[PDB]
Design a protein around this ligand. Structure first.
Ligand SMILES: Fc1ccc(Cl)cc1-c1cc(Nc2ccnc3cn(CC4CCNCC4)nc23)ccn1
Length: 299
């Protein structure tokens, strides 16, 4: 009833483990991620994450189903989700500049999705706290209304507050190196504490906020698109290269001088700095960040 009735139309590209396609399901556009049989573990883990109780949120990618498709020779392992025509936040920020209102929209919805991810919800159909672990602009999508939704949950960790355990045994350093928190880079992260994974998501989100803010154009003035640490490391940096910059030299992305001329940019810059603390225990929470950008948004 699902993979049976879906026609693939266009190749999007390979992920860590999957190949992504644009497909058609009942005349509607969907995204389809296809794995070989030897990638059964990645496919299953990812399907498990996206089928978490109470996960659905406007700012989290809309999961449709997991399925199998036998073509006659081999079996494909399918995941299916909503299609988003604008693509990644990364793509978006390269194409366009944003207004003040538009900057706040992208940062607020991102913060809102992450806060929902991080929030343990109680009750019968309770939702466990989840940490993403590969948060970045390429793993966030922009919807038709100009709001973000978070994607690429396959590396996430879920926390059972009952037994105080995480649902997988985490091998260290899984995400994108450029966006790794200092405690991840120098290998001092305490992984017996689930809050540690939340604090590393926040550091990465700060970097994403910086990527957004650069493209906020006020009166014609803006910076062009760069990734964080574009000025400090090569395109595919190693962990040792990041560690020397982030941990040893203790550098962060530069806050432009002009961001003091506007209140929105001044608040966003303040937020970034409180995501970038070398000490994860003193960083803002996604919920705290959500509240601040909410109050900012109504001015
Ligand atoms: F496919 C899935 C099925 C199921 C599940 Cl659980 C996850 C995924 C999934 C999709 C991902 N990518 C995308 C989802 C929605 N709409 C998109 C539009 N594009 C265009 C690209 C052009 C080149 N630059 C990037 C953007 N990509 C999209 C990403 C991760 N997982």
């Amino acid at each position: 009833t699902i993979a049976r009735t879906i026609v693939l139309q266009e190749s999007i590209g390979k992920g860590r483990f999957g190949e992504v396609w644009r497909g058609k399901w009942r005349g509607e556009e969907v995204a389809v991620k296809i794995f070989s049989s030897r990638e059964e573990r990645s496919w299953f883990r990812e399907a498990e994450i996206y089928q978490t109780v109470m996960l659905r949120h406007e700012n989290i990618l809309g999961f449709i189903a997991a399925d199998n498709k036998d073509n006659g020779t081999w079996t494909q392992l399918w995941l299916v989700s909503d299609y988003h025509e604008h693509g990644s936040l990364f793509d978006y920020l390269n194409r366009y500049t944003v207004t003040v209102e538009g900057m706040i929209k992208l940062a607020l919805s991102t913060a809102s999705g992450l806060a929902h991810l991080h929030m343990e919800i109680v009750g019968t159909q309770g939702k466990p706290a989840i940490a993403h672990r590969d948060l970045k602009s390429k793993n966030i999508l922009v919807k038709k209304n100009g709001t973000c939704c978070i994607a690429d949950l396959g590396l996430a960790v879920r926390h059972d507050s009952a037994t105080d355990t995480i649902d997988i045994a985490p091998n260290h350093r899984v995400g994108t190196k450029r966006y790794m928190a200092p405690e991840v880079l120098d290998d001092s992260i305490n992984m017996k504490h689930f809050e540690s994974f939340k604090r590393a998501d926040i550091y990465a989100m700060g970097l994403v906020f910086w990527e957004i803010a650069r493209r906020c154009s006020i009166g014609g003035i803006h910076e062009d698109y760069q990734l964080p640490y574009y000025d400090l490391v090569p395109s595919d940096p190693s962990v040792e290269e990041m560690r020397k910059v982030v941990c040893e030299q203790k550098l962060r992305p530069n806050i432009p001088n002009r961001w003091q001329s506007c209140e929105a940019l001044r608040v966003m810059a303040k937020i970034m700095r409180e995501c970038w603390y070398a000490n994860g225990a003193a960083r803002l929470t996604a919920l705290r960040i959500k509240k601040t950008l909410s109050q900012l948004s109504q001015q």
